[PDB]
Every structure is written in structure tokens, then in C-alpha cells.
Design a binder for these strands. Structure first.
Ligand SMILES: *C(=O)c1cnc2ccccc2n1
Ligand SMILES: *C(=O)c1cnc2ccccc2n1
Ligand SMILES: [Cl-]
Ligand SMILES: [Cl-]
Ligand SMILES: [K+]
Ligand SMILES: [Zn+2]
Ligand SMILES: [Zn+2]
Ligand SMILES: [Zn+2]
Ligand SMILES: [Zn+2]
Ligand SMILES: [Zn+2]
Lengths: 10, 8
DNA sequence: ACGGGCT
DNA sequence: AGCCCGT
């Protein structure tokens, strides 16, 4: 996720 | 065919 | 027939 | 530690 907590996705 | 991790 | 991307 | 797709 994010970053943080990429995306999703990417 | 999506690329959201692979992109085929 | 397919695995990616930083805070 | 943190998710999830379409031709
Ligand atoms: C892309 O649209 C798509 C849909 N289904 C798949 C299944 C398996 C591999 C790649 C795929 N790509
Ligand atoms: C891409 O690396 C990747 C991996 N697993 C998945 C599961 C479900 C939807 C999309 C995905 N993409
Ligand atoms: Cl999978
Ligand atoms: Cl903990
Ligand atoms: K924990
Ligand atoms: Zn897979
Ligand atoms: Zn991976
Ligand atoms: Zn880690
Ligand atoms: Zn899963
Ligand atoms: Zn599908």
C-alpha cells in the first residue's frame, strides 16, 4: 500500500 | 492483460 | 497467458 | 508491514 501502509498496486 | 504486478 | 512496488 | 487484475 501507499507507500506506505505502492498502491495497490505499483 | 491488466498490469496492476505482471503485465501480460 | 501473469506476478511488482518504498515509505 | 502493507494488497490485488484484465484483454
Ligand atoms: C489480462 O487481461 C489477463 C487475464 N487473465 C489472465 C490469466 C492468466 C494470465 C494472464 C492473464 N491476463
Ligand atoms: C502482480 O504482481 C500481482 C500478484 N498477485 C495478484 C493477485 C491478484 C490480483 C493482482 C495481482 N497482481
Ligand atoms: Cl497469484
Ligand atoms: Cl507487532
Ligand atoms: K505485528
Ligand atoms: Zn500468481
Ligand atoms: Zn512479489
Ligand atoms: Zn518487509
Ligand atoms: Zn490472493
Ligand atoms: Zn480474471
Amino acid at each position: 500500500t501507499x507507500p506506505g501502509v505502492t498502491x495497490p498496486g505499483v | 492483460x491488466a498490469x496492476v504486478x505482471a503485465x501480460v
